[PDB]
Amino acid sequence: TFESAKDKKNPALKQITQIQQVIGRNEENISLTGYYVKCEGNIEDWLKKLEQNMQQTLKDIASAAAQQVFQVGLKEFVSSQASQIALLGLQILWTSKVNEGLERLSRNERNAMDIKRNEIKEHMNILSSMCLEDLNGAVERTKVETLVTIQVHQKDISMDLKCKDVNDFEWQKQTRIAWKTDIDECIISITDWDSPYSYEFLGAKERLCITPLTDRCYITLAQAMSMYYGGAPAGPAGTGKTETVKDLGRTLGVFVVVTNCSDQHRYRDMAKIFKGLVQSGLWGCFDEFNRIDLEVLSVVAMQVESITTARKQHMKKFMFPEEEIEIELIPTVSYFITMNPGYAGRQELPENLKVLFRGVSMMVPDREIIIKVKLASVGYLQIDLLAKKFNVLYRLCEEQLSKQRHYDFGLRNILSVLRTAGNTKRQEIKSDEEMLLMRSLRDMNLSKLVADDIPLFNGLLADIFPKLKEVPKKLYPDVEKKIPEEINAESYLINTPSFQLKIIQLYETCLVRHGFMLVGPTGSGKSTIMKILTEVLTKLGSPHKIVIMNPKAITAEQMYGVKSEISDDWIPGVFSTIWAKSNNRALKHTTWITCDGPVDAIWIENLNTVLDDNKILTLANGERIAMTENCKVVFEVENLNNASPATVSRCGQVYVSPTDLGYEAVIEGWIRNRKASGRAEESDKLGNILRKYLINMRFIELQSKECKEPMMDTSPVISVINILNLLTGCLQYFVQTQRTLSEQEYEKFIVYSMAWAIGGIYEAQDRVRFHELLLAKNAPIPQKGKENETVFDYYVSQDYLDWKICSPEEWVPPQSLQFSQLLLPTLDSFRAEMLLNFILTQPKSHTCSNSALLIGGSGTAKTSSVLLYCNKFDPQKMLFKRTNFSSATSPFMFQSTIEAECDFKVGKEFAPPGNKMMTIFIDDMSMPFVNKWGDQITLELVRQLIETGGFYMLDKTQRGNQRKMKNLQYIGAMNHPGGGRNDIPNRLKRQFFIFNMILPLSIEGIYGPI
Amino acid sequence: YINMVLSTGEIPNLLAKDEREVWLGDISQAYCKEKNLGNIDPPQSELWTYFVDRVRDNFHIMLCFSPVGQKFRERARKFPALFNECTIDWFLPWPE
Amino acid sequence: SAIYFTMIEVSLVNWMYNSSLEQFLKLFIESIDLSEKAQLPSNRVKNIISFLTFHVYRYVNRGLFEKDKITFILMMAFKILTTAGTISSGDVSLFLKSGDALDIKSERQKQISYLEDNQWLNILALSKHTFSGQTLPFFKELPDLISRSENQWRNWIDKNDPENFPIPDFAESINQEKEIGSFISLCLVRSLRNDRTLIATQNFISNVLGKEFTDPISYPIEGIWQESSNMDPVLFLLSAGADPTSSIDELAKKKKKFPCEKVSMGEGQERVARQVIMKGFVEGGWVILQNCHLGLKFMEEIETLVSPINQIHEDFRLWITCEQHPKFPLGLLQKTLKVTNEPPKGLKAGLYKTFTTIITQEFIDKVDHSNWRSLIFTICFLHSIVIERKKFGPLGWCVPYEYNYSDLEASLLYIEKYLTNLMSTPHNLPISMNVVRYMICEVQYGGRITDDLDRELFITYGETYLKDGIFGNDYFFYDIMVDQKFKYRIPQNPSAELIKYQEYIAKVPTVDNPEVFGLHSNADLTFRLKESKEMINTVMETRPKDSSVGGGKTREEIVQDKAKDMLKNLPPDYNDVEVRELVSKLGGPNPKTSTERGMTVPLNIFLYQEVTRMQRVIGLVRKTLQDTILAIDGQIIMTPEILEAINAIYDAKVPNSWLYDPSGAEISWLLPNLGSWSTSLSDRNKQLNDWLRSGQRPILFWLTGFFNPQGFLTGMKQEVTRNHKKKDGEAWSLDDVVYSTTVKEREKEKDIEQPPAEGVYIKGLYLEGCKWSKNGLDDSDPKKIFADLPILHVSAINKKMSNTYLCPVYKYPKRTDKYLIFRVGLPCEGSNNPSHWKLRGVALLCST
């Protein structure tokens, strides 16, 4: 603060009256009540004056405060004073109590210490209660927290002190601050070493939780100073060696100059700092000093050695190395080195240095104590009990539960728990302290857990908190009523308890966070829950929209928008434009932005600022867009495997497990859909047969045991979805002619559609075992055939309903024949033609996407058997385009081809020429490059394109606007995975119907006519 | 590019769209005669499919690779149908 | 030629050791001239050989640290015997490995009580080996002769000096072959009583190279100067805590160069050195360069600067002093004369070094009270003892922290401050409150100590050296029967004299009896084993990778046969889906009344987790083995991991791939020997496979055999607490329960027929340093290490002392904090304190 001084005489000159330390928007103001700094012409002479007057003011203030604290209540005292002093004023009080208490124990006044401990607990009780008041500003929050982080340490020591005299060692060990009336100065004793408080203005600074290790570390650093040896704490990274040195300085009221040492530092660079320390009388620690080059350290060593020598003899002045004059030494100099053994940097220090610095090895701070402080800093009592429990759970549940990526039981989640555990404590103070924590642990971790691990956790929870019988959940009566009412509106959605629970959990995490994600395997109905929750919220007050994009389907540069290399003009980003439109307080739109594709290190890092509490999206052109209350971010990630542990902890992850929306629940859903289509009798019968084979006996679980090496690895739900698709297609003929069938006739259908959806993927050896399993369970099968006859050879005819051997249509020689371009009807092509005909003829539904992918061996006639199917298309009725994928092919290459191929439009929607319903064949679908993360970029677009029926236009002019292709069908061929070739992403698999083409047992039928 | 050429029979966006209609014009008189003397004016989409087939009949790729060079083993895995579509004659070490 | 290729083999051990070919020719040429001139041609040749070997050994041995001095002369001895037909590469290969490759499951049973299981596999190797120029195996039927009830064989193994005595039954035949006989007698000793190999090799080296090689040379600095010229500098290699700069100045005084130029190398000292060396070059004078390894840039420059092209005065001698450094300039090492000044590292010598150097007459006068001088001795005595603990290895200290003289100075500089405050105050003894002393001397040294269990050991040293009774004249620390018996007293000086401390130190014995460090007489056998394993582990890294081993089998063909024999012994790969069907069947603890099943039960969950980890290991081993058999035949290219695996398998070490994953986390148990690793795999798995298939869990759990023993015990801990929720009173929480631990003390292990109601009954833990007598702990039997513990009964006490030892169970003998499992209350009731077991280094080991 600068004030107008000497206005009457020698004007324009300015006077400094007050010091400001600003954190964020708030400030800690120490006014100089007298000792006004008159700032003369020469800058260095008034800056010296300033540093003296600051130090003069604190002394005067702290000299008044040390008198005040004894004859004033602690709540009243701490609020009045400035952070640094309040800390000093608390520590002084505490010592004067223990001294006074111990004095009485030596004179033999019994329970004198007990009386003092009772006053210290009252002191602690007030500070914990001051966290609960939630006073405004970052400064005043920091001030109260640091006080609490000290006070626990005071209470902890004094509680288990057990000394009969003041001069007994165990009390001497403890850090002791006292105001000596005789010498009129603050003195801070550690063991036998008395330093006078330097009275540097610190302000409100974050203090580290004081461990029993740290109390034994201070001592050594202290002893190191008294003997004039340097101090140098060595330990693994994250212990905060730097922080603990700084802690000791802030204790003593002395500034610490931190110097982030590196390879670039020279002996000249270092020499300047030391000369700075010795002339100023300030401490000067060096962060990561090992990372200095060994060449430099030999020179530095002589520099430290020369400083040491001078300090030992009590020399007022000494000659520094490479200095001509003798420089003034202040007695209160201390230089420290934060090093790292098991170095990530350079080899151990020189033989000269080792001598000059006394080490302190620092282990990892015991997690329990960190929690204990934090719980007290929130406004809990009986922290020591809770902290142990809280620790024991987390440490134990990490080692017992399954090692999944979205689980975090390190400090990141612990601190996240304790701020919500705290926001619960403030509102309901009367509630028991254990139950509040126990609840706050529960409601956060439950949403994260996989189905297998919920029983394990609810055990661990019960085991540590056996006093707490049962805890009531947040009822949420508004939303709970609406889900059943909402679900019944669509024909194809069933309502299970497991599923409805997983919706609620998504709505619980929706309210408190902005960046909640939704993790789960393929076809666990994440896409559905999203859609429901929003459709439920739409009906209660404000409407909710969802915007589906695929971050992987577009390049990082193209999503966020970057500077164009040509004409130097800014192209708008896809996400930026969606984000911008979405972030406007107009007609309570509350639009969610979802990122379907898998999270990777690359793309989220730009979006990392939004997910954090800042909530501002940076495009890196200077522009920063603020997130409005209404707009939110979601992620429909499967795995969450290839993401940093930091970015995970920001977002609130709900996990939807396979067992939530079971394949039973989809089947029962599909059957309910058939009754709303107007055909109740058919549905009634299909149910009695579907149930028999799929839920009553676990056919998919039994099949997967007896048959080994399935050529494509698929989940059970996928195989059931494919069953229903194929079953629909088969019966689609009987929908048009309104023909109900007998139980026998549907049974034949279902076992056909089971055999090809479930047992398709299998190879020839396994097709037999599969066919031999159907016989054991008394399904209808073709009774009579030849040797190595299988279900797969037969199909159920539409005209008359029984099993018929599929003989391929008789070949007609196509006039002039070249053996090369001659393709014939074969047994393989027909079965391929047939299954393809079932999937692609079906109308677009929830289950099907009108898309079939056929896997197979290399040159097993995949490519041919599609080209045979894609002939006999009436050019007016249906079109046929073929693109060939390859390791080179990128999403933009595939996007540009489909974008060019269907340019006809119907209002907003796009279409192929006229209205043909063009079927896009994608040969060699596996080939595109799999990156280190294990996600195929182009295929994520393919999946986006099939599922949503649209991607985002990438032409510079139009960005953040969907292009939707009203009618398209997709056939894939790919060489089956294993042996270094790429597997297709699980997410994509579900979209496609899949079956394995095989090498024929007799090519006689193929080449016999030629 | 030669892998792509061998499997597809075509390259996507190889030649200018106006240059198609000139090429296909010459192709038509052989095509109408080759297809059992059809002798009707073909459309430009049907003509393309014949020309592509014609290309593959006339265009032979001869690849001459080293088996010992580490890249060879990678190329087979990296390019499908560069190995599995063309016939492989292997050259043994010279006999006595 | 042989010798020169030995010097190249030494280059692989340490970068600093390597000498040029051009330096070798100088020794070799000089060697011919200096040798005795014979009239007879064969005598003349004989003379040159005997001289050359020595004259080169002497040279190299000077530039070799103490630990590797014995390895080099052993390499040389083999290299000589490998050229002639006395030793083939297989014979050398045997000595180093000696059937650590073999696995007890495949081979014969042991059948003898007094042999260890390793010793038996080491025998079996000798049984199958033919050596060189011999039809059938020499040591075929050795396992029959030892299995024979002849006390001669037992007596030979239990003798303090086995190698010195003749072999009980085989001695006659060994005497007949002179050239190979010495080597096959060494490979017996390596097999049985491995610990005495360093002493055996010296007997072996003596018969091969002559007596003179075993005698210590101990070059004086005058000899180093005399060898050295003006153009060839003298490079000193420095082990940490050594400084030879004072020794140069001592020699300089006799050569009238005492006031010499000294230059502490670093950054920006290159311009100071140039100036200083140019004065030396013309004027004459010695130039000592300290800490040269730091200023690496000047060391490439100095090679060309000190070359003959620049004019150098004949008096001028360059001295470089630098600690060993990787990527030192080769060019310099090829010109220079290499010397290694290492601390003599005996207790006597360690004491002597402190009193001669950092203790002075000035120092012992600073406080001027009897107690200060008396304390000085204690701290300095302690300091030297605490160093010599590091010899013993993991028994000595879990982690070896190089305690510099700094630690001693600071701890003494502390005592001045304290005693000056008591001296200021009006039997004439100060108060010297030894509670303060303990802590602060165990803070200043504590600054290095990273491990919690090494700290508590140090603390205990404090409580046995810095007690209140050291100021009285009749207190003598340890009164040991080293030679009759030496007292190890604090010397008493009526008038403070440095001479009378030094005078006492001369009386102290040269050989340090283990009793001085609180350890047992068996501690030295563990010490000798480690430094012998260390030697063998160094000479293995040198060995050539040449396929032609001899005996009609190639290196790759030996690896093949071992990779094929391993694959058949491996257990079948667990099916994840099938295991979950087996796990869902499993019962709980107290399985009659429990009525609980499935993955919900805390030990069953744990069993699943460690079954899936076991499979993950088997699967990795399975994969690699198959690829190695393919890689040698030329079916697949050799990957970087497969080459490393093949190399490891040849020399019966476990492939680094199977010990650690790419990330660095531990995937399978750490054993050194592949053979012992593959017996564990087949035993670890069997327990998991016996438990998983069967309904009932093992009566006596084998704690070693689990991947996470810490997780298993927390497993058990959970089970008991769940049984005790109805019990009262109090409700049991994982918060506020700890382990209750008792020993069974049963004559047999098979007397245990039913599990305990609450506990586990762990078996196969081994006591290090000590035995179990059934009256608590008791001093171990002579020449019996790692005495077996009975069945340990672990439970939960539920929270709620002197003469109760809080022993730690370690997962391995390496005993770092990582492999600490859990502490165990061992009573130790009669006669012996718990603080006396902590100095004896008592621990329970799972592994060995």
Ligand SMILES: Nc1ncnc2c1ncn2[C@@H]1O[C@H](COP(=O)(O)OP(=O)(O)OP(=O)(O)O)[C@@H](O)[C@H]1O
């Ligand atoms: N509650 C329900 N009742 C009946 N059918 C459902 C239910 N929830 C989802 N389904 C159907 O099951 C299929 C699951 O698709 P959904 O997109 O909901 O899962 P998803 O987790 O998003 O799958 P992916 O991870 O592949 O996107 C859909 O066809 C959907 O219509």
Ligand SMILES: Nc1ncnc2c1ncn2[C@@H]1O[C@H](COP(=O)(O)OP(=O)(O)O)[C@@H](O)[C@H]1O
């Ligand atoms: N019905 C058929 N008529 C003629 N040839 C066929 C038939 N089915 C397969 N083939 C031959 O089998 C080979 C299989 O390869 P292809 O069908 O091109 O696709 P893929 O190699 O991907 O399986 C082809 O080269 C083709 O000539």
